[PDB]
PDB file of C-alpha atoms in Angstrom:
ATOM      1  CA  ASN A   1     -27.863  14.088  -8.687  1.00 53.40           C
ATOM      2  CA  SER A   2     -24.949  15.928 -10.250  1.00 49.84           C
ATOM      3  CA  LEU A   3     -21.849  15.345  -8.006  1.00 50.14           C
ATOM      4  CA  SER A   4     -18.609  13.637  -9.149  1.00 48.11           C
ATOM      5  CA  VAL A   5     -17.582  10.227  -7.749  1.00 49.27           C
ATOM      6  CA  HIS A   6     -14.637  12.223  -6.231  1.00 48.60           C
ATOM      7  CA  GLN A   7     -17.007  14.518  -4.263  1.00 49.75           C
ATOM      8  CA  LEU A   8     -19.237  11.578  -3.251  1.00 52.73           C
ATOM      9  CA  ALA A   9     -16.123   9.866  -1.825  1.00 54.78           C
ATOM     10  CA  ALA A  10     -14.979  13.044  -0.024  1.00 55.48           C
ATOM     11  CA  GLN A  11     -18.455  13.438   1.510  1.00 51.83           C
ATOM     12  CA  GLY A  12     -18.818   9.782   2.660  1.00 49.63           C
ATOM     13  CA  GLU A  13     -22.035   9.429   0.633  1.00 47.52           C
ATOM     14  CA  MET A  14     -21.778   5.642   0.802  1.00 45.32           C
ATOM     15  CA  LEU A  15     -24.903   4.544  -0.999  1.00 43.44           C
ATOM     16  CA  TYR A  16     -24.492   7.028  -3.953  1.00 39.13           C
ATOM     17  CA  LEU A  17     -20.796   6.173  -4.228  1.00 37.21           C
ATOM     18  CA  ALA A  18     -21.489   2.465  -4.202  1.00 33.88           C
ATOM     19  CA  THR A  19     -24.175   2.861  -6.877  1.00 35.96           C
ATOM     20  CA  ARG A  20     -21.826   4.917  -9.164  1.00 36.17           C
ATOM     21  CA  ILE A  21     -18.908   2.398  -8.856  1.00 35.83           C
ATOM     22  CA  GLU A  22     -21.202  -0.573  -9.654  1.00 36.97           C
ATOM     23  CA  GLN A  23     -22.782   1.072 -12.775  1.00 40.95           C
ATOM     24  CA  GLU A  24     -19.550   2.069 -14.569  1.00 41.15           C
ATOM     25  CA  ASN A  25     -15.838   1.354 -14.234  1.00 44.21           C
ATOM     26  CA  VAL A  26     -15.049   4.745 -12.565  1.00 46.15           C
ATOM     27  CA  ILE A  27     -13.453   3.651  -9.275  1.00 46.11           C
ATOM     28  CA  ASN A  28      -9.980   4.641 -10.619  1.00 47.27           C
ATOM     29  CA  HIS A  29     -11.000   7.535 -12.894  1.00 46.28           C
ATOM     30  CA  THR A  30      -8.989  10.701 -12.435  1.00 48.10           C
ATOM     31  CA  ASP A  31     -10.315  14.234 -12.124  1.00 43.88           C
ATOM     32  CA  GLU A  32      -9.040  17.231 -14.134  1.00 43.75           C
ATOM     33  CA  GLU A  33      -5.991  17.466 -11.728  1.00 45.10           C
ATOM     34  CA  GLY A  34      -5.154  13.728 -11.883  1.00 42.07           C
ATOM     35  CA  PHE A  35      -6.720  12.702  -8.508  1.00 38.79           C
ATOM     36  CA  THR A  36      -8.697   9.529  -7.952  1.00 41.01           C
ATOM     37  CA  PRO A  37     -11.694   9.024  -5.667  1.00 40.09           C
ATOM     38  CA  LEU A  38      -9.355   7.249  -3.209  1.00 39.86           C
ATOM     39  CA  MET A  39      -7.103  10.390  -3.028  1.00 40.04           C
ATOM     40  CA  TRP A  40     -10.214  12.531  -2.395  1.00 36.92           C
ATOM     41  CA  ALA A  41     -11.342  10.203   0.449  1.00 37.73           C
ATOM     42  CA  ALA A  42      -7.867   9.985   1.959  1.00 34.60           C
ATOM     43  CA  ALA A  43      -7.346  13.763   1.909  1.00 31.86           C
ATOM     44  CA  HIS A  44     -10.741  14.198   3.562  1.00 33.18           C
ATOM     45  CA  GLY A  45     -10.059  11.562   6.280  1.00 33.64           C
ATOM     46  CA  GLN A  46     -13.003   9.398   5.194  1.00 37.06           C
ATOM     47  CA  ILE A  47     -11.969   6.182   6.761  1.00 35.25           C
ATOM     48  CA  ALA A  48     -15.029   4.124   5.848  1.00 33.60           C
ATOM     49  CA  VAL A  49     -14.851   5.351   2.193  1.00 37.78           C
ATOM     50  CA  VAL A  50     -11.217   4.380   1.947  1.00 37.93           C
ATOM     51  CA  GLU A  51     -11.978   0.885   3.275  1.00 40.35           C
ATOM     52  CA  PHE A  52     -14.860   0.499   0.780  1.00 37.81           C
ATOM     53  CA  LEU A  53     -12.837   1.813  -2.236  1.00 41.96           C
ATOM     54  CA  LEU A  54      -9.968  -0.541  -1.397  1.00 42.30           C
ATOM     55  CA  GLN A  55     -12.340  -3.584  -1.106  1.00 42.73           C
ATOM     56  CA  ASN A  56     -13.727  -2.751  -4.521  1.00 38.59           C
ATOM     57  CA  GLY A  57     -10.549  -2.356  -6.524  1.00 40.52           C
ATOM     58  CA  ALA A  58      -9.343   1.174  -6.021  1.00 40.11           C
ATOM     59  CA  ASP A  59      -5.620   1.198  -7.033  1.00 38.97           C
ATOM     60  CA  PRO A  60      -3.793   2.634  -3.934  1.00 38.37           C
ATOM     61  CA  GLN A  61      -0.620   3.198  -6.028  1.00 36.85           C
ATOM     62  CA  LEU A  62      -2.145   5.295  -8.733  1.00 35.45           C
ATOM     63  CA  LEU A  63      -0.421   8.696  -8.595  1.00 34.48           C
ATOM     64  CA  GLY A  64      -1.659  12.226  -9.248  1.00 33.19           C
ATOM     65  CA  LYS A  65      -0.347  14.568 -11.895  1.00 35.27           C
ATOM     66  CA  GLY A  66       2.576  15.590  -9.686  1.00 34.72           C
ATOM     67  CA  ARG A  67       3.058  12.010  -8.464  1.00 33.86           C
ATOM     68  CA  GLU A  68       0.989  12.634  -5.207  1.00 33.98           C
ATOM     69  CA  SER A  69      -0.247   9.449  -3.595  1.00 35.70           C
ATOM     70  CA  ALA A  70      -3.231   8.598  -1.384  1.00 38.00           C
ATOM     71  CA  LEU A  71      -0.568   7.647   1.187  1.00 35.32           C
ATOM     72  CA  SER A  72       1.232  11.035   1.083  1.00 34.24           C
ATOM     73  CA  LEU A  73      -2.164  12.887   1.356  1.00 32.47           C
ATOM     74  CA  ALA A  74      -3.148  10.804   4.430  1.00 30.89           C
ATOM     75  CA  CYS A  75       0.356  11.197   5.994  1.00 28.93           C
ATOM     76  CA  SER A  76       0.256  14.930   5.542  1.00 27.79           C
ATOM     77  CA  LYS A  77      -2.934  15.177   7.666  1.00 24.59           C
ATOM     78  CA  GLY A  78      -1.969  12.466  10.157  1.00 27.17           C
ATOM     79  CA  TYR A  79      -4.896  10.204   9.226  1.00 24.86           C
ATOM     80  CA  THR A  80      -3.281   7.132  10.698  1.00 29.47           C
ATOM     81  CA  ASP A  81      -6.154   4.639  10.345  1.00 30.63           C
ATOM     82  CA  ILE A  82      -6.120   5.416   6.634  1.00 31.23           C
ATOM     83  CA  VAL A  83      -2.304   5.317   6.475  1.00 32.39           C
ATOM     84  CA  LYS A  84      -2.553   1.780   8.071  1.00 28.89           C
ATOM     85  CA  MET A  85      -5.105   0.525   5.544  1.00 31.33           C
ATOM     86  CA  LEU A  86      -2.940   1.795   2.716  1.00 30.60           C
ATOM     87  CA  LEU A  87       0.349   0.312   4.140  1.00 32.82           C
ATOM     88  CA  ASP A  88      -1.543  -2.986   4.494  1.00 32.29           C
ATOM     89  CA  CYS A  89      -2.035  -2.872   0.623  1.00 32.19           C
ATOM     90  CA  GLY A  90       1.715  -2.897   0.159  1.00 30.31           C
ATOM     91  CA  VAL A  91       2.029   0.596  -1.348  1.00 31.21           C
ATOM     92  CA  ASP A  92       5.520   2.045  -1.876  1.00 32.07           C
ATOM     93  CA  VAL A  93       6.174   3.803   1.466  1.00 32.49           C
ATOM     94  CA  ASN A  94       9.120   5.714  -0.131  1.00 33.06           C
ATOM     95  CA  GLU A  95       7.170   7.231  -3.095  1.00 32.89           C
ATOM     96  CA  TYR A  96       9.204  10.392  -4.087  1.00 30.50           C
ATOM     97  CA  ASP A  97       6.938  13.094  -5.731  1.00 32.11           C
ATOM     98  CA  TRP A  98       7.390  16.220  -8.061  1.00 35.26           C
ATOM     99  CA  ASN A  99       6.790  18.809  -5.337  1.00 32.59           C
ATOM    100  CA  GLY A 100       9.894  16.975  -3.773  1.00 31.74           C
ATOM    101  CA  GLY A 101       8.039  15.006  -0.925  1.00 34.50           C
ATOM    102  CA  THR A 102       7.955  11.427   0.506  1.00 30.23           C
ATOM    103  CA  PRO A 103       5.126  10.168   2.801  1.00 30.27           C
ATOM    104  CA  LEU A 104       7.606  10.404   5.727  1.00 34.22           C
ATOM    105  CA  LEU A 105       8.537  14.047   4.969  1.00 30.17           C
ATOM    106  CA  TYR A 106       4.804  15.047   4.993  1.00 33.71           C
ATOM    107  CA  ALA A 107       4.149  13.186   8.273  1.00 29.79           C
ATOM    108  CA  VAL A 108       7.196  15.118   9.645  1.00 28.29           C
ATOM    109  CA  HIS A 109       6.045  18.500   8.297  1.00 27.83           C
ATOM    110  CA  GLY A 110       2.762  18.066  10.175  1.00 30.63           C
ATOM    111  CA  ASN A 111       4.413  16.754  13.390  1.00 33.52           C
ATOM    112  CA  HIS A 112       2.415  13.515  13.110  1.00 34.36           C
ATOM    113  CA  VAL A 113       4.520  11.344  15.391  1.00 29.18           C
ATOM    114  CA  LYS A 114       2.297   8.256  15.346  1.00 28.95           C
ATOM    115  CA  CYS A 115       2.320   8.466  11.602  1.00 29.75           C
ATOM    116  CA  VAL A 116       6.117   8.814  11.520  1.00 28.37           C
ATOM    117  CA  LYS A 117       6.454   5.691  13.797  1.00 30.33           C
ATOM    118  CA  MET A 118       4.064   3.722  11.590  1.00 27.34           C
ATOM    119  CA  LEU A 119       5.959   4.664   8.410  1.00 29.69           C
ATOM    120  CA  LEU A 120       9.461   3.752   9.819  1.00 30.67           C
ATOM    121  CA  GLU A 121       7.953   0.452  11.034  1.00 33.07           C
ATOM    122  CA  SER A 122       6.895  -0.259   7.389  1.00 34.09           C
ATOM    123  CA  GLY A 123      10.252   0.570   5.791  1.00 36.19           C
ATOM    124  CA  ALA A 124      10.198   4.319   5.274  1.00 36.76           C
ATOM    125  CA  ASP A 125      13.754   5.651   4.888  1.00 37.00           C
ATOM    126  CA  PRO A 126      14.276   8.873   6.944  1.00 39.31           C
ATOM    127  CA  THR A 127      17.556   9.741   5.218  1.00 39.18           C
ATOM    128  CA  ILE A 128      16.261   9.955   1.695  1.00 37.77           C
ATOM    129  CA  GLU A 129      17.190  13.437   0.490  1.00 37.95           C
ATOM    130  CA  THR A 130      15.383  16.117  -1.508  1.00 38.34           C
ATOM    131  CA  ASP A 131      17.019  17.774  -4.530  1.00 39.96           C
ATOM    132  CA  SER A 132      18.498  20.436  -2.151  1.00 37.15           C
ATOM    133  CA  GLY A 133      20.057  17.677  -0.024  1.00 38.98           C
ATOM    134  CA  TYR A 134      17.949  17.609   3.161  1.00 39.67           C
ATOM    135  CA  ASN A 135      16.221  14.599   4.742  1.00 38.12           C
ATOM    136  CA  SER A 136      13.309  13.945   7.223  1.00 37.12           C
ATOM    137  CA  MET A 137      15.649  14.332  10.266  1.00 35.29           C
ATOM    138  CA  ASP A 138      16.879  17.663   8.894  1.00 36.88           C
ATOM    139  CA  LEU A 139      13.295  18.825   8.530  1.00 36.34           C
ATOM    140  CA  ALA A 140      12.351  17.768  12.067  1.00 35.27           C
ATOM    141  CA  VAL A 141      15.427  19.536  13.460  1.00 35.11           C
ATOM    142  CA  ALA A 142      14.657  22.710  11.613  1.00 32.60           C
ATOM    143  CA  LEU A 143      10.985  22.795  12.715  1.00 35.41           C
ATOM    144  CA  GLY A 144      12.094  21.792  16.284  1.00 34.16           C
ATOM    145  CA  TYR A 145       9.742  18.780  16.405  1.00 33.33           C
ATOM    146  CA  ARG A 146      11.624  17.066  19.244  1.00 32.02           C
ATOM    147  CA  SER A 147       9.447  13.915  19.681  1.00 28.85           C
ATOM    148  CA  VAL A 148       9.715  13.292  15.933  1.00 28.99           C
ATOM    149  CA  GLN A 149      13.548  13.772  16.151  1.00 27.60           C
ATOM    150  CA  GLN A 150      13.675  11.234  18.997  1.00 24.44           C
ATOM    151  CA  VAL A 151      11.681   8.646  16.934  1.00 23.98           C
ATOM    152  CA  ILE A 152      13.911   9.102  13.879  1.00 24.05           C
ATOM    153  CA  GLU A 153      17.105   9.001  15.982  1.00 23.42           C
ATOM    154  CA  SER A 154      16.051   5.706  17.577  1.00 20.63           C
ATOM    155  CA  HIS A 155      15.600   4.273  14.093  1.00 22.18           C
ATOM    156  CA  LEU A 156      19.008   5.443  12.941  1.00 22.81           C
ATOM    157  CA  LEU A 157      20.612   3.963  16.138  1.00 23.01           C
ATOM    158  CA  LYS A 158      19.195   0.563  15.106  1.00 24.81           C
ATOM    159  CA  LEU A 159      20.895   1.048  11.671  1.00 27.48           C
ATOM    160  CA  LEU A 160      24.297   1.135  13.473  1.00 26.88           C
ATOM    161  CA  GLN A 161      24.183  -2.690  13.422  1.00 25.29           C
ATOM    162  CA  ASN A 162      25.619  -2.904  10.640  1.00 27.22           C
TER     163      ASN A 162
END
């Protein structure tokens, strides 16, 4: 029975995962690349696993070796049930990482409109810039993701009051 807690979480092997987490304090242990079981479950869209890991003390704010978050991994794939559960934990929705990204920029790069709406609704800032000076709107314009552009422009209109 030789699989890591990370792979058990990715596979939704609920009973084996639950057994492992109960036996030893490994719920937040990182793999050789800095990823936690929660990050593995989020990147694999394992909604039930995410729920279970959160109920049992998985830290949703723990970051990977390049400052990747469970939130950014879920945003990048448009896993919006998982993004919701994570936002509900009060994670930083503006986490800036070392490959340059924010959860909103990943949701934009994948044209995940529902995800983009959900992030803005929780405080994501679309005009945060990368080191080369572009923001989420700039990205959406360049990719030609028009529904995304419309969602972001509605948000910026609201910022005009002010």
